[PDB]
Write a protein that binds this ligand. Structure first.
Ligand SMILES: Nc1ncnc2c1ncn2[C@@H]1O[C@H](COP(=O)(O)OP(=O)(O)O)[C@@H](O)[C@H]1O
Ligand SMILES: Nc1ncnc2c1ncn2[C@@H]1O[C@H](COP(=O)(O)OP(=O)(O)O)[C@@H](O)[C@H]1O
Ligand SMILES: [Mg+2]
Ligand SMILES: [Mg+2]
Lengths: 400, 151, 192, 172, 316, 370, 168
């Protein structure tokens, strides 16, 4: 492999985190959005991305998010997003560098195939590793890079903008049969905040204002009928949020029960959706109880949080208490049949200083390894087998 | 692991092409002599400018077999050389006077010619294909699809 | 593929979809070739909602968890290797009679091509583990899967036979008068 | 999940069709048995749960107490549709007029005629109407004490926002 | 983008943040650039003090062409001892900044512009020596041919600035000539790059851009570079020549001309990549044309009416 | 399927994409009681909509929320849209995309509030706003022509050549069937009959819809009516008393050809059509003249197509064939062409979607619906 | 385009239309299953002989045929390295859409640029004369499509040259 630093690109549904292996942060963290125009033809040169795309809606560009619900679904826009990432922001030559890419555990064979042909034929990268994204978020949880600080067994709950998935990993191996996914994350709680501002007919219900009300005003409560009652009993529970309009004037928004009812989307997904029903503490139980019996203590002892939509105030404490309730009720059913007390299991949900970008920090830490260039597809593999080299699922069991 | 071991190839032997098509009732040197008598007539008919009679005589017998590629390719060299020397205005009058079996042999050997363009001129074989299919219909190609694999 | 079926009512919908569209691949690298090189495996299914879903490799990839249990997280051997390890544990004098009558039963035996795959995969497993890859004796190994049309109901149809064989033999059944004096020890009649 | 009626834990409760004629605190005339004035009853429960329950899109009914809580939940959605822009006094007269006016019972345009039983006799229909009229008059009067709690000449926006939150996509 | 930025965008945004920031956090950031260049940005002793260091494989050649003198002239009191593994370094102290937002902005710009400032010294050496030769040729026009002939060999700069590009340049009394001994090693970029290099030279023959530097192209080397060490006439290099005349490096235009000529092969490389995204949209547009030729094989049948989620509908 | 809602100034016309005709067609009216509500109970309401307002009208003040193609009252327009979805079509609007319509040269805010109410009040999955005359050209089976569309509140001309609109040549005229109804009230007053209330304005609209017609030569018809009983005929009011009228039958529609009858300084609908053709580039004019497409209820008068052809033949050079296309279904051509458009497969990519509105706000309509 | 291609595309049309006499046929090697027999090859009596139609050494068809399936594969004109890149990538976008063009393969057979599989079901559910019209209209146009793409590539190489060279 080349001696140049690998380039790390976590392309999320909400945000892309771009940087180089071994740095103390991503070089860029900006929305996974493209601004596109809607006698020589140049409208495919005229686009913008990230923070510079958000500035272009008033100039008549159509904004789009080429990743939705965790999966790339517009390969024209994702190719233009990557070329602009590589040549504007990272300012790099693909021929000199190995790349770490990411996508959700479910992601189609078709997506890794389409990713490999853009990377090896459009850009001609030296080599590509498409990582299992929340497996990197386990490695970001270490107290330091030294081997004695590693905890190679843990459940990881990743919750970004587009999807939340719970991954069991034990001794560094991903138990792919036990992956659970909930199709609801940080964007669906924004659409719920937006919908509640809109039901009150508030002066502003733009998407940025609903987003900023999540980041600043929202938190996870114990129980929504007790918390609705606390919003009768105590008057300063309602906040006032000052927002500036697209046409440049002030507004003031009263923010109310969406402060607790919007983060409740994870703990009662029947608020968000007709199609998904199991709450996150029961969904994490289903991951560990489908997983092999000898790893269950290790998977409960280390439940790592990952992705921006896990950062709600009191989120890890609600998950820990509700999962500890599920776990001890199941252990006590067995103690009451057997007539003897167990040792129990400690359920620990872990929030940590790198939790916001744990996939990128893990990708950086794993791409720093001396062995890394041997796990990549090299362009010499792609010259023989084409994009079919990337098609086989890494995380799940394959037939053949 | 067991999944990849081919058991079917030894426990259930499949039909061979000679179970579908009857065996050739002539030896390799017997057919090689029969074609070696015809190729000189086919060459000679070009020199007298009677290439139409060159085809009518060459077409009176056809070699077949997986044991006879050398004489099959010599017969195909003579066939494409004969078809290349017939004038394009003579083709409609000749095709309508061929039997269904002579037509079947013409459309079979223009197909063997079209399979190897570095040896054979496709432009004359496609001109012959247009006129033979126009006059005798689609069923002559259907007889080539259905034909023996060692023609 | 982005579809969702998490409602308790939708489990019967994918049961009917599986039961209509799934089949057992006879040759995995061939079905993977038809799957990855071709669109011929693609099929449309209409849900009782009226929604239409597209299904392709999942048609052979779903029932493959019977022949490869690791696909559903199980460490057990699949159908062919579970049946082979069972017959190959029987005494030498009876192994032939067990291979000459491998009787399939129950609805999950009904996938298209399952008898064909099972017979092949037992011949193929005897060729690996008994002949060590020597072709010369493989034609002499006889296996016969019994694969009757009625076999989804063979337990009922056989229960209706056995219940007639013991209908007049009133002592063969555990009695209410025997249950109320012995309790659960009345069931010790029902074999070892 | 959603919140069910604590009164599903009651037994030998009077019933019509499959509504439970639960103990009720009220001053309106009708058949409902007087509850204790010191304890929550189904209307303190129904209004207390409504603004959580109207967000859920899935609900499994445990018995006739929940069929009663659901009819109340659907009628609170009707009241919050009727109440908007009114003074507290105009709202009391409008929502009593709503409560009193001729409505469909189960077994007749009723929205949930698959989940509720028809009245068990020609006389069961009259006891079902005379209960549901008393219940929904009390339910209207009690709701107004919450939506006009802090101010008296305009309904609280913290209650009017549920006026389009159609419980389970059903309405009366 | 139709054109590349000249400066490192990360260094510009980071310094524009830290020069404004109320509370600077620490940093430890290795940052790549084009042509194998790399930067290290860090706070190695205090959060208050940022060290920016450049690594560049041709820096020893550039020092022979007066680079340290230009970097001391540009960065002044901020110049620092080189960091280990880096060729040049600058220390900026966040409590020692200029008194205005506009001086802070042009300092954040100046430090982001550092790759093109280290690489500008051979071009300033050529422009300033052309002004000496211009004055001597203005003194005696019949001696000028001999001054130009000796300056073509005695005042030539070659920079082997990456392993598949040599930039060669020299002054003569009326011009600076610069030759890019240029190559694409990736085979699809060599194929598209032949079209880009051909249409580049043919563009300069059209009336609309006669105001530009003269351009010439070949694939043997220009006569005056044929014996420069590391130029090779059979080794798949093309040779793009620019003749900058006095009007292309006039005092209002020198620094833009330097910035813009250094990025030549980088704009060509970038547009050879971006052309694939253009070809791909050209392709999938006529995949959608060929759909309409297959759609005429679908026999016409009415589908049942469906809601937006695909559920069946029972009206009309 | 998708809803098509041609919410015009005088009639709402609504239904489903791919249907032969609109299955909901009702007055674009909200009615409110103007009298003492003395009997308690009685099935009384705070307001009434459409055919319910039109049948109760003797006790109601009637008002249209839309005038000259512009929504003037959004609270009553939401009341009308609610009546379309829940009462008249009997659908969940959150289950169906909706194709809406408006006249060209409308205020920008009309399109914005119309998209906002569809996504935020009616919770629609997707919507689009089409220009009404562009829809009417699909209903003609044509991809070139000039469409003269005249409804209740607005008349407009849109020229289209080979699917390209010429937006500089588009004409609007804020004169159509409501101005003709008001003028019929003003001239009925001269023969003896006063119609004054918003309810009596519906009686004289019904007189206009079956007594009135366009004269081929106005001054000859005016002289023929001034000298004979033969142009006179009668109508019966709800009260059973009879109205007889004569030259009022063709003087009312003549206001489309002579807007000065209502005090307007504008060209008539014939000369406005010719001025739109003459604003187009010289090569396209021949095919516009051969394709004058009539639309909307104000084009339903007897003789108006024969008059329009006579008048345009005098303005155009005699060297070419003027043709006026006036289908018998032209009462609904905007809705018919909306049901064509909403059923095309490329149009399924042209919808504004819920997700895309939520990301962009109501300004998304100006950069997607043209 | 068809004056130079006419003899060739007439031979392709005639023999593709002869070859599409397809039928429902279940497998003789697997029970309760049917497979496109040309694509599996496990029972040779229901394979018809593979036919090559050719204009040139570089411009060729392979027609492979069976009781229930035809596989049709083509080599297309690629006279320079630009066309080798442009053709390969255009066929990859076209085969990436194969679910919506139901008779496309997702991969070509080795040594061919694009490939088609027409099965029994396609001859039952689609108009088979319009299937062979789509094949021949694709073969008629693809050389004009690819040549126009190298004009667009030339036009962009001029755009960046003129934009670059005009800002000195
Ligand atoms: N403090 C916070 N509290 C709650 N949510 C947050 C917070 N900070 C960021 N988010 C949300 O996290 C999501 C982005 O997380 P990220 O991990 O970057 O998602 P992704 O990788 O899928 O794009 C957005 O919905 C964002 O608004
Ligand atoms: N037969 C008719 N004769 C004359 N006017 C008519 C006729 N039918 C309808 N109209 C008039 O047309 C107008 C309604 O036309 P319409 O196209 O539905 O308008 P809109 O779309 O703007 O609501 C009303 O003024 C109505 O009286
Ligand atoms: Mg993410
Ligand atoms: Mg109208």
């Amino acid at each position: 492999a080349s001696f140049n630093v690998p380039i790390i690109m976590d392309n999320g549904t909400g945000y892309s985190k771009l940087g180089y292996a071994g740095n103390d942060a991503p070089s860029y963290v900006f929305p996974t959005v493209i601004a596109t125009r809607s006698k020589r033809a140049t409208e495919d040169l005229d686009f913008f991305i990230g923070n510079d795309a958000l500035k272009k809606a008033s100039a008549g560009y159509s904004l789009d998010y080429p990743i939705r619900h965790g999966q790339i679904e517009n390969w024209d826009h994702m190719e233009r997003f990557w070329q602009q990432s590589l040549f504007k922001y990272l300012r790099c030559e693909p021929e000199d560098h190995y790349f770490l890419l990411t996508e959700p555990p479910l992601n189609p064979p078709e997506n890794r195939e389409n990713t490999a042909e853009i990377m090896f034929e459009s850009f001609n990268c030296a080599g590509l590793y498409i990582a299992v994204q929340a497996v990197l978020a386990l490695a970001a949880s270490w107290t330091s890079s030294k081997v004695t600080d590693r905890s190679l067994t843990g459940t990881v709950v990743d919750s970004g903008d587009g999807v939340t998935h719970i991954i069991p990993v034990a001794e560094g191996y991903v138990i792919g049969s036990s992956i659970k996914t909930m199709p609801l994350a940080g964007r669906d709680v924004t659409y719920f905040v937006q919908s509640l501002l809109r039901d009150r007919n508030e002066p502003d219900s733009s998407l940025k204002t609903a987003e900023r009300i999540k980041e600043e005003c929202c938190y996870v409560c114990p129980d929504i009928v007790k918390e609705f009652s606390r919003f009768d009993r105590e008057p300063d529970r309602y906040l006032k949020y000052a927002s500036e309009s697209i046409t440049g004037h002030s507004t003031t928004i009263d923010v109310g029960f969406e402060r607790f009812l919007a983060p409740e989307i994870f703990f009662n997904p029947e608020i968000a959706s007709s199609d998904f029903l199991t709450p996150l503490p029961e969904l994490v139980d289903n991951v560990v109880q489908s997983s092999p019996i000898d790893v269950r203590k290790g998977l409960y002892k280390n439940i790592v949080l990952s992705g921006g939509s896990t950062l709600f105030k009191n989120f890890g404490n609600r998950l820990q208490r509700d999962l500890k309730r599920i776990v001890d009720e199941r252990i006590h059913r067995s103690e009451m049949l057997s007539g003897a007390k167990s040792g129990g299991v400690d359920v620990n949900v872990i929030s940590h200083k790198r939790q916001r970008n744990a996939v990128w920090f893990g990708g950086s830490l794993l791409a720093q390894t001396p062995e890394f260039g041997s796990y990549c597809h090299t362009k010499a593999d792609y010259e023989e087998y084409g994009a079919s080299i990337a098609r086989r699922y890494q995380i799940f069991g394959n037939s053949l | 692991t067991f999944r990849t071991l081919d058991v079917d190839s030894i426990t259930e032997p499949v039909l061979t092409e000679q179970d579908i098509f009857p065996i050739r009732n002539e030896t390799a040197e017997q057919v090689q002599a029969a074609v070696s008598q015809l190729i000189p007539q086919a060459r000679s008919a070009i020199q007298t400018g009677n290439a139409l009679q060159g085809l009518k005589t060459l077409l009176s017998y056809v070699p077949y077999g997986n044991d006879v590629q050398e004489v099959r390719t010599q017969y195909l060299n003579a066939f494409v050389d004969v078809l290349s020397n017939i004038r394009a205005a003579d083709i409609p009058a000749f095709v309508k006077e061929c039997s269904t079996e002579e037509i079947d042999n013409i459309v079979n050997f223009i197909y063997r010619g079209l399979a190897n363009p570095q040896a054979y001129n496709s432009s004359v074989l496609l001109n012959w294909h247009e006129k033979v299919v126009e006059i005798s219909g689609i069923g002559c190609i259907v007889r080539v699809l259905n034909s023996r694999p060692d023609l | 593929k982005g579809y969702a079926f998490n409602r308790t009512a939708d489990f019967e919908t994918v049961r009917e979809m599986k039961e209509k569209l799934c089949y057992v691949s006879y040759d995995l690298e061939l079905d993977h070739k038809l799957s990855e090189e071709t669109t011929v495996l693609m099929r449309n299914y209409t849900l009782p909602d009226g929604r239409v879903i597209k299904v392709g490799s999942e048609r052979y990839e779903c029932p493959e968890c019977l022949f490869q249990p690791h696909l559903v997280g199980s460490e057990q051997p699949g159908l062919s290797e579970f049946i082979f390890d069972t017959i190959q544990a029987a005494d030498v004098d009876i192994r032939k009679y067990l291979y000459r009558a491998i009787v399939l039963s129950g609805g999950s035996s009904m996938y298209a091509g399952l008898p064909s795959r099972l017979e092949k995969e037992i011949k193929q497993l005897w060729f690996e583990r008994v002949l060590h890859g020597d072709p010369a004796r493989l034609p002499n190994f006889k296996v016969k899967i019994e694969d009757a049309p009625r076999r989804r109901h063979a337990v009922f149809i056989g229960g209706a036979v056995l219940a007639d064989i013991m209908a007049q033999n009133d002592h063969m059944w555990v009695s209410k008068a025997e249950w109320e004096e012995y309790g659960v020890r009345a069931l010790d009649k029902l074999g070892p | 999940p959603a919140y069910h009626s604590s009164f599903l834990s009651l037994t030998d409760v009077p019933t019509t069709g499959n509504i439970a004629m639960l103990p009720l605190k009220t001053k309106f005339r009708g058949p409902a048995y007087p509850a204790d004035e010191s304890q929550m009853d189904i209307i303190d429960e129904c209004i207390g749960l409504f603004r959580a329950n109207c967000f859920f899109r899935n609900f499994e009914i445990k018995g006739p107490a929940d069929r009663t809580l659901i009819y109340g939940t659907l009628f609170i959605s009707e009241c919050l549709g009727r109440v908007n822009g009114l003074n507290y006094r105009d709202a009391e007269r409008q929502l009593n007029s709503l409560a009193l006016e001729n409505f469909s019972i189960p077994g007749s345009g009723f929205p949930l005629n698959a989940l509720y039983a028809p009245p068990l006799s020609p006389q069961d229909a009259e006891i079902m109407r005379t209960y549901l009229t008393q219940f929904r008059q009390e339910l209207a009067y009690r709701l107004l004490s919450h939506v006009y709690a802090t101010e008296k000449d305009h309904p609280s926006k913290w209650w009017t926002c549920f006026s389009k939150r159609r419980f389970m996509n059903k309405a009366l | 983008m139709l054109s590349l930025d000249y400066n490192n965008i990360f260094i510009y945004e980071l310094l524009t943040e830290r020069f404004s920031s109320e509370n600077p956090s620490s940093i430890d950031q290795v940052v790549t650039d084009f042509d194998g260049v790399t930067f290290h940005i860090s706070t190695p002793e205090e959060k208050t003090k940022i060290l920016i260091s450049l690594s560049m494989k041709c820096y020893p050649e550039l020092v022979n062409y007066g680079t340290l003198d230009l970097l001391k002239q540009i960065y002044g009191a901020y110049v620092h001892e080189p960091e280990m593994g880096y060729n040049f370094s600058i220390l900026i102290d966040l409590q020692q900044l200029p008194a205005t937002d506009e001086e802070k902005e042009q300092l954040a710009m100046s430090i982001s512009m550092l790759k093109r400032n280290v690489l500008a010294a051979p071009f300033h050496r050529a422009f300033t020596k052309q002004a000496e030769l211009a004055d001597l040729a203005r003194k005696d026009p019949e001696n000028a041919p001999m001054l130009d002939k000796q300056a073509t060999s005695q005042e030539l700069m070659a920079i082997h600035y990456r392993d598949e590009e040599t930039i060669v340049l020299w002054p003569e009394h009326d011009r600076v000539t610069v030759v890019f001994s240029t190559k694409f090693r990736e085979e699809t970029d060599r194929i598209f790059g032949k079209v880009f290099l051909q249409e580049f030279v043919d563009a300069r023959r059209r009336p609309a851009i006669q105001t530009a530097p003269q351009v010439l192209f070949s694939y043997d080397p220009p006569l005056e570079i044929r014996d420069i060490q590391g130029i090779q006439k059979g080794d798949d290099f093309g040779f793009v020549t620019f003749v900058l005349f006095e009007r292309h490096f006039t005092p209002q235009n020198r620094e833009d001309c330097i910035s813009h000529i250094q990025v030549f092969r980088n704009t060509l490389h970038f547009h050879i990549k971006a052309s694939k995204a253009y070809m791909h949209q050209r392709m999938r547009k006529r995949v959608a044309d060929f759909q309409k030729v297959l759609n005429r094989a679908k026999p016409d049948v009415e589908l049942e009416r469906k809601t937006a989620t695909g559920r069946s509908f029972v009206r009309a | 399927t998708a809803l098509v809602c041609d919410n015009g100034s005088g009639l709402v016309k609504a239904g489903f994409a791919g249907d032969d005709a609109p299955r909901a067609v009702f007055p674009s009216i909200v009615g409110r009681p103007r009298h003492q509500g003395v009997m308690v109970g009685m099935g009384q309401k705070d307001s009434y909509v459409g055919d319910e307002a039109q049948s109760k009208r003797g006790i109601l003040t009637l008002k249209y929320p839309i005038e000259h193609g512009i929504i003037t009252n959004w609270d009553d327009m939401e009341k009308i849209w609610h009546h379309t979805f829940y009462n008249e079509l009997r659908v969940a609007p959150e289950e169906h995309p909706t194709l809406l319509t408006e006249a060209p040269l409308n205020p920008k805010a009309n399109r914005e509030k119309m998209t906002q109410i569809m996504f935020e009040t009616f919770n629609v999955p997707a919507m689009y706003v089409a220009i009404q005359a562009v829809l009417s050209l699909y209903a003609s089976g044509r991809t070139t022509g000039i469409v003269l569309d005249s409804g209740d509140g607005v008349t407009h001309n849109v020229p289209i050549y080979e699917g390209y609109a010429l937006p500089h040549a588009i004409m609007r005229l804020d004169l159509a069937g409501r101005d003709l109804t008001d003028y019929l009230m003003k001239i009925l007053t001269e023969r003896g009959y006063s119609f004054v209330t918003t309810a009596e304005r519906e009686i004289v609209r019904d007189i206009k819809e079956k007594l009135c017609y366009v004269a081929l030569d106005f001054e000859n018809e005016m002289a023929t009516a001034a000298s004979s009983s033969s142009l006179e005929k009668s109508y019966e009011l709800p009260d059973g008393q009879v109205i007889t009228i004569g030259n009022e039958r063709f003087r009312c529609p003549e206001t489309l050809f002579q807007p000065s009858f209502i005090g307007m300084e504008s060209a008539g609908i014939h000369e406005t059509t010719y001025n739109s053709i003459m604003k187009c580039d010289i090569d396209i004019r021949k095919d516009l003249y051969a394709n004058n497409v009539m639309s909307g209820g104000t084009t339903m008068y007897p003789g108006i197509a024969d008059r329009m052809q006579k008048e345009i033949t005098a303005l155009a050079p005699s060297t070419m064939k003027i043709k006026i296309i006036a289908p018998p279904e032209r009462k609904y051509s905007v809705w018919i062409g909306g049901s064509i458009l909403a059923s095309l497969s490329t149009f399924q990519q042209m919808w504004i979607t819920k997700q895309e509105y939520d990301e962009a706000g109501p300004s998304i309509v100006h950069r997607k619906c043209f | 385009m068809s004056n130079t291609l006419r003899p060739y595309l007439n031979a392709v049309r005639s023999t593709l239309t002869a070859s599409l006499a397809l039928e429902e046929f279940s497998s003789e090697i697997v029970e309760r299953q049917s497979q496109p027999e040309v694509e599996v090859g496990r029972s040779p009596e229901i394979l018809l002989k593979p036919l090559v139609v050719s204009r040139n050494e570089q411009e060729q068809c392979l027609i492979e045929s069976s009781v229930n399936s035809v596989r049709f594969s083509i080599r297309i004109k690629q006279v320079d390295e630009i066309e080798r890149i442009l053709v390969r990538k255009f066929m990859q976008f076209l085969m990436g859409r194969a679910e919506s063009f139901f008779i496309l393969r997702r991969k070509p057979v080795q040594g061919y640029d694009i490939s088609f599989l027409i099965t029994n079901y396609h001859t039952e559910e689609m108009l088979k004369h319009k299937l062979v019209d789509f094949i021949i209209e694709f073969m008629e146009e693809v050389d004009a499509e690819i040549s126009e793409m190298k004009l667009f590539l030339n036009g962009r190489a001029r755009l960046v040259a003129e934009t670059y060279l005009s800002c000195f």
